[PDB]
Symmetry: C6
Subunit: 255 residues, 6 copies
Amino acid sequence: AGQAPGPALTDWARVREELASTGPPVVAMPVVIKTEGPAWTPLEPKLITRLADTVRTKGLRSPITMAEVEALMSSPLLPHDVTNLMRVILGPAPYALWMDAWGVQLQTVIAAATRDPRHPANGQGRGERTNLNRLKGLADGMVGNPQGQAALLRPGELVAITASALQAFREVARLAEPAGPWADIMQGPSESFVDFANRLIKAVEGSDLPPSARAPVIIDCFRQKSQPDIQQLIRTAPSTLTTPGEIIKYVLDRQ
Amino acid sequence: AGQAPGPALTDWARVREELASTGPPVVAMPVVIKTEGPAWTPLEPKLITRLADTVRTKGLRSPITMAEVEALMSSPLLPHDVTNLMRVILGPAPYALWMDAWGVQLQTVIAAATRDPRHPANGQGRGERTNLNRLKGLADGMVGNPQGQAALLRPGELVAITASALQAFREVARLAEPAGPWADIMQGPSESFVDFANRLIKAVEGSDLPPSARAPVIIDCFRQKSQPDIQQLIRTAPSTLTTPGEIIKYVLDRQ
Amino acid sequence: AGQAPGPALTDWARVREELASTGPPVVAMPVVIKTEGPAWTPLEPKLITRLADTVRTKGLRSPITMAEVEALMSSPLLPHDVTNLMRVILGPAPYALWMDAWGVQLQTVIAAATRDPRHPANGQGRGERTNLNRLKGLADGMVGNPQGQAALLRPGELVAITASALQAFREVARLAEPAGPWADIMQGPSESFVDFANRLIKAVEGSDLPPSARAPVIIDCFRQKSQPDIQQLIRTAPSTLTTPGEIIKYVLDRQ
Amino acid sequence: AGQAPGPALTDWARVREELASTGPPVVAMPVVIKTEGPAWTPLEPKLITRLADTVRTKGLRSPITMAEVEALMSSPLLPHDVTNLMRVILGPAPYALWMDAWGVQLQTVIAAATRDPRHPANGQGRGERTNLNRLKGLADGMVGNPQGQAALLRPGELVAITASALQAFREVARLAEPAGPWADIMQGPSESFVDFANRLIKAVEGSDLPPSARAPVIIDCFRQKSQPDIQQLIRTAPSTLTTPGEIIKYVLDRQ
Amino acid sequence: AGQAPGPALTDWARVREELASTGPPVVAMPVVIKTEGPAWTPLEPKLITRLADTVRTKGLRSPITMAEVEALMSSPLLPHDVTNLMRVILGPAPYALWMDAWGVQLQTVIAAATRDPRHPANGQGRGERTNLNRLKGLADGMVGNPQGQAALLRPGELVAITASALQAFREVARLAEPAGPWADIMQGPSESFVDFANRLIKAVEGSDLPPSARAPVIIDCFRQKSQPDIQQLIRTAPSTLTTPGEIIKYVLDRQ
Amino acid sequence: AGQAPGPALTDWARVREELASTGPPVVAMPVVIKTEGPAWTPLEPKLITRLADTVRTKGLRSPITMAEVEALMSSPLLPHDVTNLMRVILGPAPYALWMDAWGVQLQTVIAAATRDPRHPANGQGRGERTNLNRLKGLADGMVGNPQGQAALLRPGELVAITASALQAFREVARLAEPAGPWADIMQGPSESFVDFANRLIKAVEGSDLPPSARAPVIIDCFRQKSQPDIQQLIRTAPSTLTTPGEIIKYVLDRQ
């Protein structure tokens, strides 16, 4: 039993968390292997906002959003937490999908609770068992009470809960690839072509396309979403202009 | 060791407040419950200042300002606090209307105070049965003595107070519509068209009209509330110039 | 016995202060009591300085300055301190008048001291009584001894002192009729018309007086305190011009 | 002894200090009295530094410099410290002068020592005496050793000391008629006529002698210490221009 | 006995570290010894980030990158750490290679382990020798347990490990010509020559080439990786132009 | 009893150091002492860095670098610290020389040792004497072991060590008549005349040169180290021209 020296290690999560937020397509590769703390795991709002941002921008056929969520759900999390996390990231419509899916995942645990009355999450006698009510939060002291849910549930059940949740999440997050951010990028008459080009180029830098498909998309935005007379100015540009840079030059020539 | 580890749980409350106070247009879906704490709950002044900003600017004409009071009035706190918040936010005349509404509201408690003694804000024995004077703060140890009210009142009496007050607020925050900030928006030689326009766009954003009413209202403050040669300049502008953007472009074109 | 659980409740004191400095026009109305505390108050430097800044800047000709000085004399404090505060705010000359006025004010307390001895600023038997030299800090161990004055005075006497002071203050702050800091605003070659004007607009922000007197006064002062060739330029200006902004426009046209 | 009350009743220290460092000619008028603390008084640099800044600039041709020293030398000070303080501010040549002057002062203490032994800076019995070598810092254990001086001295002797020091200072703060830093001021091609004019306005701001003498001096510092071609410009200027402002405007007229 | 006096004497490690981070080109010669402290060391993320910065920028065969790597591998660490670190700095492919090399090293310790079954890191009972599973973190209780690896492996073995690791790094850090970043310095129309040239000059400062080979390589880069039209401008350029500065001047001449 | 009340006394040292490092040519004059403290001082990194910066820039051309070194070697320190200080500031060539010089100094202790076997560093018998190996830190336990040196050396020995060290340095810091970094600053096309002047003003401010040798050198620096085409522009400048300011004006005339 506690307390154990020193603490602490290296920390790789601290390192990890750094490298990622420190040149992210350079990729944080150090393992992060966390044990202890309470039965359940505390939370950080910062991780949530930066996840909200990603959920805004990329969404969630991105494997950044997916990567950052995955990592966050290595946690033994309470039902109230899962509820909030899910309702927050998914918002009304997809949360329903998830809620349902997740309900199947619980249903599949009542199968394994029945197959194994004594698996990790499970108890050793008839009441002590992991039951529908536990799992749905309908047990007495769970419902309306996250501390009670925390006082009643075991870490094994919390992990089972978080996998079920992650599962139901993977099952739901495969819908609606068609991009996205770019579509709300229109040149302001307030804005310079270059400020726009840069805002857009930033979004394109942030796209997941093959570089070779980037430039046709960029040129389409230039052609379609700059300023009409400038679009027309582009119409007079040759086809011998073949990259946005050449086009940028053509505009720079006239100012 | 003991009691209640860590203290305590995690971190929805914090995350809510965080997330709210972060890019507000669409924010903060996690459920937050906060048991227990002292019998009553000392205030957050910053949240209250910015509420005053909202209450100033938009007021209660947003259900964001209203939404934010609601949230702030989940708190159990004392008649002195109710008083000090309401006098300050309402200002004299509407504070008076509220006062009257709040007494009415309190009158409905004197029915539920007689009818029932089982309720959280009432006692069983005659001396435990709650009196008017306590509920009106006109009880001994209450008048000129919040520490005394704090010392006399039960939690159930706070929620009751809070409920009569919120009701009496809901009952008063029906009154008034006509927008609003706009009425002070007019262009001097003190600011440029660009400056005025921005100030206006920011306001525009803050108006609650559907987008369909926004251009005609913008256009109207422009023609009459721009600088006099510039209103005239707008009178020379083609009718064909239809969105604000085009009209802005027409000003952009000539200096 | 003792002391004071938690401490504490709302704040309403700091909240009051806060609000005032948070949109000055109409803000800051909660009730503030401050319950119990040093009854032998050891003030705060910042609160005096910003008052100093108002006394310097505006002066004391303000029912807001007077108000904030009142508010600062809500405290139970020592005569010595009352003296230093008054010496700094009043400035030497009025301070002297005050000092006399305060002695008269104090003289009328020797009436209520002789009439009654029950009151908080007094004691029952002959020595128990609060003597004049004591009330004036003029008794032994008080002379050249504010701590000794603190050890010899009891709380009620301090409130009395404060009331006498506070009255004596009010009897002196009837003040001038000329206004104001404005009189030394004059355009040098050190500053543009715009800067000068803006400096004048700041001063106009500082004119609380009838909105209706401001533009004739401004046109006159602008005419007279502007740079001479500008004065003459204003001497060429149209009579039809009715506001400074029009007048600014006229200058704005020529350079 | 105690328990203490609390420590402790306050401020006018910070209030005093604050006001002075918040506009020096907007005189600080409270009163601060002091006791206690160890035998004597330790110091922090901010006042020493800001004094050095004064000592450089006006020095001790300001009766505010003399004043800020007078006040710092209200303190019960240990001789080594004093010695050093004087060694810093005076500089070797006047430091010497002081040294000699102080030594006389020290002689005058042997007078009050020979006359009497009843003083705070002396013992009553002959063994109790505050001898010459001791008075000189040069008694056994005082030699080279301010902690030993501190272990052998008495507070009454720190006062005695501080007076001896302070006196010898005052006789010597007789100093220079000439002024002042101003004399090195001459326009470089590094700086503009305006930069020179604002810098000369700092020199003027630091020239506190009659205003009526300031403008002739100012204009002279223009005539002889402006850049040469600008001098030549000033020669073309008419004697009709009678202020620096009028002259500044003539310059401003030309580019 | 223990723990440490005072704690403690200080600190050429800090001084070393300071100096390095203080105008890096030629600094940092104090000897730095530091035992005691932990049994084995939990690193500090900062050193890793800056190394990651160097690994990015320079890469890893530099005489300074190697120097900071040696230093980071100057004290015992877990296999787990070593793993994560090597995997991050080398990247998967070179890390894999690294493992291979490291394995050869690990084999070579099983020789020194067979040769001396009673070596200081080795066993002093019987089968509690330095085995492949220990060295691999796969001994019982080290299996998926970095804490268990830290609790079962002896410091002598960690040092042994650290040398093998370092060897395998030396053994691997024998590859890679590329220079490198440089290949991505081009001039888009997004940058001026002056920004580009500066970016390039920084990259050339960071070159290892003799200065005398630096200018032909910049001159070629200037000719080849400027904006095309800027290259045509360079194309007109005298053969007598013979430095980048002369080239810079040449462009400077034309706009 | 003991051990150190209050803390503390005046300061005189930190203040001293401040004043110096705040007004450098207007040098700080308090006497500074600091008994007691550690047995021997284990360095301060900021203070070593700022000496390092002086050692970079001026080094021992300023009797400031020495001054700061003297102050820093004004208390007893370890052979390892001394060694580390010397190898870092002298760097390899002058360090070797100093080792040698220091070795001479160590020889002179074996004389003073022979003459008095029981002088301050020594102790009763031979082993309490300070043998050569002790003096070299090569006595059993000191040997590559600065903790061992701290465990084995007395203060009396360190102060002989420190003196000897400082002595051999004073002896060594003679070499170099040439002045100063300046010889490596020339104009590029990368930065203009104003920036060259800035560098030049810096070199001038950094000259120790009599003021009278600064104009020949400065003008020489202009004729010889400015941009060539500018040196040529300068070749046309009148021979009457005497200061940089007239040259600056000549360039300005052509700007």
